[PDB]
Protein backbone atom coordinates (compact mmCIF):
# COMPACT_ATOMS: atom_id res chain seq x y z
CA UNK A 1 0.00 0.00 0.00
CA UNK A 2 2.20 2.90 1.16
CA UNK A 3 5.30 0.84 0.31
CA UNK A 4 3.70 0.72 -3.13
CA UNK A 5 3.19 4.45 -3.20
CA UNK A 6 6.83 5.03 -2.11
CA UNK A 7 8.21 2.80 -4.87
CA UNK A 8 6.00 4.50 -7.49
CA UNK A 9 7.23 7.89 -6.27
CA UNK A 10 10.83 6.62 -6.42
CA UNK A 11 10.51 5.22 -9.99
CA UNK A 12 9.15 8.51 -11.27
CA UNK A 13 11.84 10.60 -9.53
CA UNK A 14 14.44 8.31 -11.11
CA UNK A 15 13.41 9.57 -14.61
CA UNK A 16 14.98 12.98 -13.84
CA UNK A 17 18.35 11.39 -13.17
CA UNK A 18 20.75 11.81 -16.10
CA UNK A 19 24.33 10.81 -16.97
CA UNK A 20 27.25 12.59 -15.27
CA UNK A 21 24.99 14.07 -12.59
CA UNK A 22 26.24 14.61 -9.08
CA UNK A 23 23.48 13.53 -6.69
CA UNK A 24 22.58 14.07 -3.07
CA UNK A 25 21.01 10.95 -1.59
CA UNK A 26 18.52 11.40 1.30
CA UNK A 27 17.37 8.93 3.97
CA UNK A 28 14.27 7.08 5.19
CA UNK A 29 12.01 4.34 3.95
CA UNK A 30 11.00 6.17 0.72
CA UNK A 31 14.66 6.84 -0.23
CA UNK A 32 15.43 3.16 0.56
CA UNK A 33 13.09 2.22 -2.33
CA UNK A 34 14.89 4.67 -4.63
CA UNK A 35 18.49 3.58 -4.06
CA UNK A 36 18.28 0.07 -5.41
CA UNK A 37 16.35 1.32 -8.48
CA UNK A 38 19.16 3.79 -9.04
CA UNK A 39 21.68 0.96 -8.70
CA UNK A 40 19.79 -1.09 -11.32
CA UNK A 41 20.25 1.86 -13.69
CA UNK A 42 23.94 2.15 -12.84
CA UNK A 43 24.44 -1.53 -13.63
CA UNK A 44 22.94 -0.73 -17.06
CA UNK A 45 25.25 2.19 -17.87
CA UNK A 46 24.01 5.31 -15.99
CA UNK A 47 26.94 7.44 -14.74
CA UNK A 48 26.38 9.24 -11.39
CA UNK A 49 28.37 10.16 -8.29
CA UNK A 50 26.44 10.39 -5.04
CA UNK A 51 26.71 11.96 -1.63
CA UNK A 52 24.84 9.97 1.05
CA UNK A 53 23.14 11.66 4.01
CA UNK A 54 23.24 8.79 6.54
CA UNK A 55 25.06 5.54 7.29
CA UNK A 56 22.12 3.38 6.19
CA UNK A 57 21.70 5.36 2.94
CA UNK A 58 25.45 4.93 2.38
CA UNK A 59 25.33 1.20 3.13
CA UNK A 60 22.50 0.77 0.60
CA UNK A 61 24.45 2.71 -2.00
CA UNK A 62 27.48 0.40 -1.67
CA UNK A 63 25.27 -2.69 -1.65
CA UNK A 64 23.55 -1.68 -4.91
CA UNK A 65 26.58 -0.37 -6.77
CA UNK A 66 25.80 3.37 -6.57
CA UNK A 67 29.14 5.27 -6.68
CA UNK A 68 29.75 7.29 -3.50
CA UNK A 69 31.86 10.40 -2.99
CA UNK A 70 31.86 13.25 -0.44
CA UNK A 71 31.04 16.95 -0.33
CA UNK A 72 34.75 17.58 0.16
CA UNK A 73 35.30 16.25 -3.36
CA UNK A 74 31.99 17.49 -4.83
CA UNK A 75 30.84 20.62 -2.90
CA UNK A 76 28.05 21.52 -5.39
CA UNK A 77 25.52 18.83 -6.41
CA UNK A 78 23.07 18.92 -9.35
CA UNK A 79 20.13 17.26 -7.64
CA UNK A 80 19.12 16.06 -4.20
CA UNK A 81 16.63 13.23 -3.77
CA UNK A 82 15.08 12.90 -0.35
CA UNK A 83 11.93 12.13 1.57
CA UNK A 84 10.02 14.22 4.11
CA UNK A 85 8.02 13.52 7.26
CA UNK A 86 5.71 16.37 6.19
CA UNK A 87 5.20 18.57 3.09
CA UNK A 88 3.18 21.76 3.79
CA UNK A 89 2.61 25.32 2.36
CA UNK A 90 5.13 26.48 -0.24
CA UNK A 91 6.59 22.95 0.09
CA UNK A 92 8.04 23.72 3.49
CA UNK A 93 9.06 20.37 4.98
CA UNK A 94 9.52 18.69 8.26
CA UNK A 95 12.34 16.15 8.21
CA UNK A 96 14.54 14.34 10.67
CA UNK A 97 12.21 11.69 12.05
CA UNK A 98 14.98 9.12 11.34
CA UNK A 99 17.63 11.39 12.91
CA UNK A 100 19.58 12.33 9.74
CA UNK A 101 18.40 15.97 9.37
CA UNK A 102 21.75 17.70 9.73
CA UNK A 103 23.52 15.90 6.91
CA UNK A 104 20.27 16.02 4.90
CA UNK A 105 19.93 19.76 5.33
CA UNK A 106 23.59 20.44 4.45
CA UNK A 107 23.27 18.20 1.36
CA UNK A 108 20.04 19.95 0.28
CA UNK A 109 21.73 23.40 0.56
CA UNK A 110 24.65 22.15 -1.49
CA UNK A 111 22.31 21.10 -4.35
CA UNK A 112 20.98 23.06 -7.34
CA UNK A 113 17.63 21.34 -6.84
CA UNK A 114 15.97 19.26 -4.17
CA UNK A 115 13.27 16.80 -5.20
CA UNK A 116 11.13 15.27 -2.46
CA UNK A 117 9.79 11.73 -2.96
CA UNK A 118 6.64 10.83 -0.97
CA UNK A 119 3.38 8.95 -0.71
CA UNK A 120 0.28 11.17 -0.39
CA UNK A 121 -0.01 11.03 3.43
CA UNK A 122 3.02 13.33 3.79
CA UNK A 123 1.03 16.19 2.29
CA UNK A 124 -0.49 18.47 4.96
CA UNK A 125 -2.56 21.63 4.90
CA UNK A 126 -0.58 22.92 7.90
CA UNK A 127 2.75 21.72 9.34
CA UNK A 128 3.28 20.39 12.87
CA UNK A 129 1.26 17.27 13.54
CA UNK A 130 4.62 15.47 13.14
CA UNK A 131 6.88 16.42 16.06
CA UNK A 132 9.58 18.85 14.89
CA UNK A 133 13.09 17.49 15.39
CA UNK A 134 15.72 19.85 16.82
CA UNK A 135 19.39 18.88 16.80
CA UNK A 136 21.10 20.14 19.97
CA UNK A 137 24.54 20.24 21.57
CA UNK A 138 25.06 17.90 24.49
CA UNK A 139 26.83 20.69 26.42
CA UNK A 140 24.25 22.70 28.42
CA UNK A 141 21.34 20.74 26.97
CA UNK A 142 19.25 21.39 30.10
CA UNK A 143 19.59 25.15 29.48
CA UNK A 144 18.96 24.61 25.79
CA UNK A 145 15.72 22.80 26.72
CA UNK A 146 14.59 25.78 28.85
CA UNK A 147 15.35 28.20 25.97
CA UNK A 148 13.24 26.12 23.52
CA UNK A 149 10.39 26.01 26.08
CA UNK A 150 10.51 29.82 26.45
CA UNK A 151 10.71 30.40 22.67
CA UNK A 152 7.68 28.05 22.28
CA UNK A 153 5.77 30.05 24.93
CA UNK A 154 6.50 33.38 23.20
CA UNK A 155 5.25 32.03 19.88
CA UNK A 156 2.18 30.32 21.35
CA UNK A 157 3.30 26.73 20.86
CA UNK A 158 2.22 23.91 23.17
CA UNK A 159 3.25 20.29 23.59
CA UNK A 160 5.78 18.00 25.25
CA UNK A 161 9.44 18.45 24.32
CA UNK A 162 11.15 15.06 24.54
CA UNK A 163 14.76 13.99 24.37
CA UNK A 164 15.04 11.25 21.74
CA UNK A 165 16.35 8.06 23.34
CA UNK A 166 18.11 4.99 22.06
CA UNK A 167 16.97 2.52 24.71
CA UNK A 168 18.57 4.00 27.85
CA UNK A 169 20.90 6.57 26.25
CA UNK A 170 20.18 9.73 24.31
CA UNK A 171 20.20 9.14 20.59
CA UNK A 172 23.37 10.58 19.10
CA UNK A 173 23.51 11.87 15.54
CA UNK A 174 26.31 11.44 13.03
CA UNK A 175 27.43 14.96 13.87
CA UNK A 176 27.69 13.95 17.53
CA UNK A 177 24.58 15.75 18.67
CA UNK A 178 21.37 14.95 20.55
CA UNK A 179 17.83 15.57 19.32
CA UNK A 180 14.74 17.00 20.87
CA UNK A 181 11.37 16.17 19.38
CA UNK A 182 8.86 18.98 19.85
CA UNK A 183 5.23 17.88 19.64
CA UNK A 184 3.78 21.28 18.85
CA UNK A 185 0.87 19.99 16.72
CA UNK A 186 0.61 23.07 14.48
CA UNK A 187 3.31 25.42 13.14
CA UNK A 188 1.66 28.43 11.47
CA UNK A 189 4.73 30.64 11.25
CA UNK A 190 7.58 28.27 10.34
CA UNK A 191 9.93 31.04 9.18
CA UNK A 192 9.64 32.74 12.60
CA UNK A 193 9.97 29.49 14.54
CA UNK A 194 13.05 28.61 12.51
CA UNK A 195 14.69 31.98 13.17
CA UNK A 196 13.94 31.78 16.92
CA UNK A 197 15.28 28.25 17.20
CA UNK A 198 18.47 28.89 15.22
CA UNK A 199 19.22 31.93 17.48
CA UNK A 200 19.33 29.68 20.53
CA UNK A 201 23.08 28.98 21.13
CA UNK A 202 22.69 25.24 21.88
CA UNK A 203 20.50 24.52 18.83
CA UNK A 204 22.61 23.18 15.95
CA UNK A 205 19.76 22.78 13.43
CA UNK A 206 16.14 21.80 13.14
CA UNK A 207 13.87 19.82 10.78
CA UNK A 208 12.10 22.75 9.05
CA UNK A 209 13.39 22.92 5.44
CA UNK A 210 12.22 26.29 4.07
CA UNK A 211 12.62 27.22 0.42
CA UNK A 212 14.89 24.19 -0.08
CA UNK A 213 12.58 21.73 -1.87
CA UNK A 214 12.00 22.57 -5.57
CA UNK A 215 9.74 19.62 -6.58
CA UNK A 216 7.58 17.17 -4.72
CA UNK A 217 7.02 13.82 -6.49
CA UNK A 218 4.00 12.39 -4.72
CA UNK A 219 2.33 9.06 -5.46
CA UNK A 220 -1.42 9.20 -4.82
CA UNK A 221 -3.74 6.51 -3.49
CA UNK A 222 -5.62 6.49 -6.84
CA UNK A 223 -2.28 5.79 -8.59
CA UNK A 224 -1.60 9.28 -9.91
CA UNK A 225 2.02 10.42 -9.51
CA UNK A 226 1.97 14.20 -9.35
CA UNK A 227 5.05 16.27 -10.07
CA UNK A 228 4.42 19.33 -7.92
CA UNK A 229 5.98 22.75 -7.47
CA UNK A 230 5.97 25.03 -4.43
CA UNK A 231 3.16 27.06 -6.05
CA UNK A 232 1.01 23.89 -5.80
CA UNK A 233 1.16 24.22 -2.02
CA UNK B 1 50.60 47.18 30.98
CA UNK B 2 47.60 45.61 29.16
CA UNK B 3 48.06 42.69 31.58
CA UNK B 4 47.72 45.41 34.28
CA UNK B 5 44.54 46.70 32.68
CA UNK B 6 43.20 43.14 32.48
CA UNK B 7 43.84 42.60 36.21
CA UNK B 8 42.28 45.94 37.03
CA UNK B 9 39.16 44.99 35.06
CA UNK B 10 39.13 41.59 36.80
CA UNK B 11 39.54 43.03 40.31
CA UNK B 12 36.67 45.44 39.72
CA UNK B 13 34.32 42.73 38.37
CA UNK B 14 35.15 40.53 41.33
CA UNK B 15 33.39 43.08 43.59
CA UNK B 16 30.02 42.09 42.08
CA UNK B 17 30.55 38.47 43.05
CA UNK B 18 28.52 37.79 46.22
CA UNK B 19 28.26 34.70 48.39
CA UNK B 20 26.34 31.69 47.12
CA UNK B 21 26.07 33.00 43.52
CA UNK B 22 25.99 30.59 40.61
CA UNK B 23 28.69 31.85 38.18
CA UNK B 24 29.51 31.39 34.52
CA UNK B 25 33.24 31.45 33.93
CA UNK B 26 34.34 32.61 30.49
CA UNK B 27 37.69 32.14 28.76
CA UNK B 28 40.63 34.17 27.49
CA UNK B 29 43.64 35.93 28.92
CA UNK B 30 41.47 38.52 30.75
CA UNK B 31 39.37 35.78 32.44
CA UNK B 32 42.67 34.00 33.30
CA UNK B 33 43.42 37.05 35.53
CA UNK B 34 39.99 36.80 37.14
CA UNK B 35 40.01 33.09 38.16
CA UNK B 36 43.02 33.27 40.52
CA UNK B 37 41.52 36.38 42.16
CA UNK B 38 38.26 34.53 42.59
CA UNK B 39 40.20 31.57 44.00
CA UNK B 40 41.87 33.89 46.54
CA UNK B 41 38.43 35.09 47.63
CA UNK B 42 37.24 31.47 47.94
CA UNK B 43 40.26 30.67 50.13
CA UNK B 44 38.90 33.48 52.33
CA UNK B 45 35.48 31.89 52.65
CA UNK B 46 33.56 33.27 49.66
CA UNK B 47 31.07 30.67 48.45
CA UNK B 48 30.51 30.21 44.69
CA UNK B 49 29.70 27.54 42.13
CA UNK B 50 30.99 28.03 38.60
CA UNK B 51 30.32 26.57 35.19
CA UNK B 52 33.48 26.86 33.03
CA UNK B 53 33.39 27.51 29.26
CA UNK B 54 36.69 25.92 28.13
CA UNK B 55 39.14 23.28 29.34
CA UNK B 56 41.79 25.82 30.26
CA UNK B 57 39.26 27.83 32.41
CA UNK B 58 38.24 24.63 34.14
CA UNK B 59 41.92 23.70 34.66
CA UNK B 60 42.54 27.12 36.29
CA UNK B 61 39.38 26.74 38.35
CA UNK B 62 40.61 23.40 39.84
CA UNK B 63 44.13 24.90 40.27
CA UNK B 64 42.76 27.78 42.38
CA UNK B 65 40.02 25.98 44.33
CA UNK B 66 37.11 27.50 42.47
CA UNK B 67 34.24 25.00 42.78
CA UNK B 68 32.94 23.53 39.54
CA UNK B 69 29.47 22.27 38.48
CA UNK B 70 27.43 21.87 35.24
CA UNK B 71 24.52 23.47 33.42
CA UNK B 72 22.87 20.05 33.86
CA UNK B 73 22.93 20.56 37.63
CA UNK B 74 22.43 24.34 37.47
CA UNK B 75 20.56 25.30 34.26
CA UNK B 76 20.23 29.01 35.12
CA UNK B 77 23.18 31.03 36.40
CA UNK B 78 23.14 34.37 38.24
CA UNK B 79 26.17 35.96 36.60
CA UNK B 80 28.51 35.21 33.70
CA UNK B 81 31.99 36.73 33.66
CA UNK B 82 33.72 36.70 30.29
CA UNK B 83 36.10 38.61 28.07
CA UNK B 84 35.53 39.77 24.48
CA UNK B 85 37.67 40.13 21.35
CA UNK B 86 35.60 43.19 20.49
CA UNK B 87 32.99 45.32 22.24
CA UNK B 88 31.10 47.51 19.74
CA UNK B 89 27.81 49.48 19.39
CA UNK B 90 24.99 48.46 21.75
CA UNK B 91 27.62 46.24 23.49
CA UNK B 92 27.47 43.68 20.69
CA UNK B 93 30.47 41.38 21.11
CA UNK B 94 32.76 39.43 18.94
CA UNK B 95 34.05 36.43 20.89
CA UNK B 96 35.72 33.16 20.08
CA UNK B 97 39.31 34.14 19.35
CA UNK B 98 40.49 31.46 21.82
CA UNK B 99 38.14 28.87 20.25
CA UNK B 100 35.51 28.61 23.01
CA UNK B 101 32.61 30.51 21.47
CA UNK B 102 29.89 27.82 21.68
CA UNK B 103 30.19 26.97 25.36
CA UNK B 104 30.67 30.68 26.06
CA UNK B 105 27.43 31.57 24.25
CA UNK B 106 25.39 28.75 25.82
CA UNK B 107 26.67 29.85 29.28
CA UNK B 108 26.03 33.57 28.55
CA UNK B 109 22.49 32.63 27.40
CA UNK B 110 21.90 30.63 30.54
CA UNK B 111 22.81 33.55 32.91
CA UNK B 112 20.70 36.41 34.39
CA UNK B 113 23.39 38.92 33.55
CA UNK B 114 26.61 38.76 31.62
CA UNK B 115 29.52 40.97 32.63
CA UNK B 116 32.26 41.57 30.09
CA UNK B 117 35.71 42.27 31.45
CA UNK B 118 38.09 44.15 29.14
CA UNK B 119 41.06 46.41 28.68
CA UNK B 120 40.53 49.68 26.70
CA UNK B 121 41.66 48.22 23.38
CA UNK B 122 38.58 46.00 22.95
CA UNK B 123 36.12 48.88 22.68
CA UNK B 124 35.57 49.63 18.98
CA UNK B 125 33.38 52.15 17.13
CA UNK B 126 32.62 49.62 14.40
CA UNK B 127 32.87 45.83 14.71
CA UNK B 128 34.81 43.58 12.41
CA UNK B 129 38.53 44.30 12.41
CA UNK B 130 38.94 41.14 14.48
CA UNK B 131 38.15 38.09 12.36
CA UNK B 132 34.73 36.68 13.19
CA UNK B 133 34.83 33.07 14.31
CA UNK B 134 32.25 30.70 12.85
CA UNK B 135 31.79 27.25 14.35
CA UNK B 136 30.89 24.78 11.60
CA UNK B 137 30.18 21.10 11.22
CA UNK B 138 32.99 18.97 9.81
CA UNK B 139 30.48 17.14 7.52
CA UNK B 140 30.19 19.13 4.26
CA UNK B 141 32.58 21.85 5.42
CA UNK B 142 33.60 22.68 1.84
CA UNK B 143 29.93 23.27 0.97
CA UNK B 144 29.49 25.38 4.10
CA UNK B 145 32.58 27.51 3.20
CA UNK B 146 30.86 28.30 -0.13
CA UNK B 147 27.53 29.16 1.51
CA UNK B 148 29.32 31.57 3.93
CA UNK B 149 31.16 33.13 0.94
CA UNK B 150 27.73 33.56 -0.72
CA UNK B 151 26.09 35.07 2.38
CA UNK B 152 29.06 37.49 2.68
CA UNK B 153 28.67 38.62 -0.96
CA UNK B 154 24.99 39.37 -0.27
CA UNK B 155 25.80 41.55 2.71
CA UNK B 156 28.68 43.22 0.83
CA UNK B 157 31.49 41.64 2.92
CA UNK B 158 34.88 40.59 1.54
CA UNK B 159 37.98 38.93 2.90
CA UNK B 160 39.66 35.59 3.36
CA UNK B 161 37.74 32.79 5.10
CA UNK B 162 40.42 30.56 6.68
CA UNK B 163 40.03 27.37 8.71
CA UNK B 164 41.23 27.45 12.34
CA UNK B 165 44.35 25.31 12.61
CA UNK B 166 46.10 23.79 15.55
CA UNK B 167 49.19 22.37 13.83
CA UNK B 168 48.46 20.79 10.46
CA UNK B 169 45.23 19.40 12.04
CA UNK B 170 42.07 21.45 12.01
CA UNK B 171 41.36 22.81 15.47
CA UNK B 172 38.49 20.78 16.95
CA UNK B 173 36.31 22.63 19.49
CA UNK B 174 34.85 20.97 22.63
CA UNK B 175 31.61 20.48 20.69
CA UNK B 176 33.52 18.40 18.11
CA UNK B 177 33.41 21.16 15.48
CA UNK B 178 35.77 23.20 13.33
CA UNK B 179 36.02 26.97 13.09
CA UNK B 180 36.31 29.35 10.18
CA UNK B 181 37.81 32.72 10.88
CA UNK B 182 36.33 35.36 8.57
CA UNK B 183 38.63 38.35 8.03
CA UNK B 184 35.89 40.70 6.85
CA UNK B 185 37.44 43.79 8.43
CA UNK B 186 34.15 45.61 8.91
CA UNK B 187 30.65 44.48 9.95
CA UNK B 188 28.07 47.33 9.89
CA UNK B 189 24.97 45.13 9.93
CA UNK B 190 25.73 42.59 12.68
CA UNK B 191 22.11 41.42 13.23
CA UNK B 192 21.57 40.63 9.52
CA UNK B 193 24.89 38.84 9.36
CA UNK B 194 23.98 36.81 12.45
CA UNK B 195 20.60 35.80 10.96
CA UNK B 196 22.26 34.86 7.65
CA UNK B 197 25.03 32.72 9.13
CA UNK B 198 22.76 30.82 11.47
CA UNK B 199 20.42 29.98 8.52
CA UNK B 200 23.32 28.09 6.84
CA UNK B 201 22.85 24.39 7.71
CA UNK B 202 26.47 23.62 8.53
CA UNK B 203 27.00 26.70 10.72
CA UNK B 204 26.68 25.59 14.34
CA UNK B 205 27.20 29.11 15.82
CA UNK B 206 29.32 32.26 15.43
CA UNK B 207 31.20 34.85 17.52
CA UNK B 208 28.65 37.70 17.44
CA UNK B 209 27.00 38.05 20.85
CA UNK B 210 23.94 40.27 20.29
CA UNK B 211 22.04 41.66 23.29
CA UNK B 212 23.79 39.21 25.60
CA UNK B 213 26.22 41.47 27.49
CA UNK B 214 24.62 43.63 30.16
CA UNK B 215 27.69 45.34 31.59
CA UNK B 216 31.19 46.01 30.34
CA UNK B 217 33.93 46.57 32.94
CA UNK B 218 36.73 48.32 31.05
CA UNK B 219 40.14 49.35 32.36
CA UNK B 220 41.53 52.48 30.63
CA UNK B 221 45.16 53.50 30.18
CA UNK B 222 44.52 56.53 32.45
CA UNK B 223 43.60 54.07 35.29
CA UNK B 224 39.84 54.78 35.19
CA UNK B 225 37.69 51.65 35.42
CA UNK B 226 34.37 52.22 33.68
CA UNK B 227 31.36 50.14 34.47
CA UNK B 228 29.34 50.54 31.31
CA UNK B 229 25.87 49.59 30.17
CA UNK B 230 24.62 48.93 26.65
CA UNK B 231 23.06 52.44 26.59
CA UNK B 232 26.68 53.74 26.75
CA UNK B 233 27.59 52.15 23.39
O1 LIG C 1 15.65 11.59 6.24
C2 LIG C 1 14.48 11.61 6.85
C3 LIG C 1 14.54 11.63 8.36
O4 LIG C 1 15.91 11.79 8.75
C5 LIG C 1 13.36 11.60 6.10
O6 LIG C 1 13.46 11.57 4.75
C7 LIG C 1 11.99 11.59 6.73
O8 LIG C 1 12.00 10.97 8.04
C9 LIG C 1 11.00 10.86 5.81
O10 LIG C 1 11.23 9.44 5.77
P11 LIG C 1 10.21 8.40 5.07
O12 LIG C 1 10.69 8.35 3.64
O13 LIG C 1 10.41 7.17 5.93
O14 LIG C 1 8.83 8.98 5.21
O1 LIG D 1 36.92 33.09 25.25
C2 LIG D 1 37.26 34.06 24.43
C3 LIG D 1 37.60 33.56 23.06
O4 LIG D 1 37.07 32.23 23.01
C5 LIG D 1 37.29 35.36 24.82
O6 LIG D 1 36.97 35.76 26.07
C7 LIG D 1 37.71 36.45 23.88
O8 LIG D 1 38.52 35.86 22.86
C9 LIG D 1 38.52 37.49 24.68
O10 LIG D 1 39.87 37.05 24.91
P11 LIG D 1 40.99 37.85 25.78
O12 LIG D 1 40.35 38.17 27.11
O13 LIG D 1 42.08 36.79 25.77
O14 LIG D 1 41.37 39.09 25.01
CL1 LIG E 1 19.91 3.67 -17.86
K1 LIG F 1 22.36 28.16 17.14
K1 LIG G 1 22.60 26.37 11.32
First to last CA, chain A: 24
How do the domains of chain B map onto residue ranges?
1-120+199-220, 121-198
Chain B residues in contact with A174 (beta carbon < 8 A): 139
- Per the CB < 8 Å rule, is B75 touching A146? yes
Tell me how far apart the alpha carbons of residues B207 and B181 are, in angstroms, rounded to a whole number: 10
* A99 Cα to the center of ligand 4, angstroms: 18
Class for domain B1-120+199-220, per CATH? alpha beta
CB of A120 within 8 A of CB of A221? Answer: yes
Chain A residues in contact with B69 (beta carbon < 8 A): none
Tell me how far apart the alpha carbons of residues A156 and A151 are, in angstroms, rounded to a whole number: 9
User: Is A72 part of the annotated catalytic residue set?
Assistant: no
Nearest to B157 by CA among B183, B137, B176, B179: B183
Decide which of 3.20.20.150, 3.40.605.10, 3.40.50.300, 3.30.70.260 is the CATH code for B121-198.
3.30.70.260
Tell me how far apart the alpha carbons of residues B185 and B132 are, in angstroms, rounded to a whole number: 9
Tell me how far apart the alpha carbons of residues B32 and B52 are, in angstroms, rounded to a whole number: 12
For residue A120, give Cα distances in angstroms to A5, A30, A131: 8, 12, 18
Active-site entry in A33, A58, A86, A104: A104
> Is-same-fold flag (A1-120+199-220; A121-198)?
no
* B118 Cα to the center of ligand 2, angstroms: 9
- The CA-based dihedral angle spanning residues A46, A49, A53, A57, taken in that order and rounded to the nearest 10 degrees: 40
Active-site entry in B33, B58, B86, B104: B104
List residues bridging with B228 in a β-sheet: B216
Nearest CA in chain A to B202: A106
- Per the CB < 8 Å rule, is B110 touching A140? yes
- Per the CB < 8 Å rule, is A144 touching B106? yes
The per-residue DSSP string of chain A comes to -HHHHHHHHHHHHHTT--TTEEEEE--SHHHHHHHHHHHHHHHTT--EEEEESSHHHHHHHHHTT--B--TTT--SBSEEEE--SEE-GGG-EE--TTS-HHHHHHHHHTBS-EEEEEEGGGB-SSS-SSPEEEEE-STTHHHHHHHHHHHHHHHT--S-EEE-EETTEE---TTS-EEEEE--S--S-HHHHHHHHHTSTTEEEESEE-S---EEEEE-TTS-EEEE-GGG-
Tell me how far apart the alpha carbons of residues A148 and A204 are, in angstroms, rounded to a whole number: 12
Resolution (A): 2.3
- Please give all residues whose beta carbon lies within 6 A of any atom in ligand 2, as ranges: B 26-31, 82-85, 95-101, 104
CB of A9 within 8 A of CB of A35? Answer: no
Give the determination technique.
X-ray
Residue with CA nearest ligand 2 atom 1:
B27
Amino acid sequence: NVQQLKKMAALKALEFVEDDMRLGIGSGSTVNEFIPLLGERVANGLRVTCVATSQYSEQLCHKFGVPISTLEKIPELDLDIDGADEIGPEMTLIKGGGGALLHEKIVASASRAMFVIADETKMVKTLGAFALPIEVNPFGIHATRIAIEKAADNLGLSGEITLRMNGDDPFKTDGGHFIFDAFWGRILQPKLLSEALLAIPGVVEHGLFLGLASRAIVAMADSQIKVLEPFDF
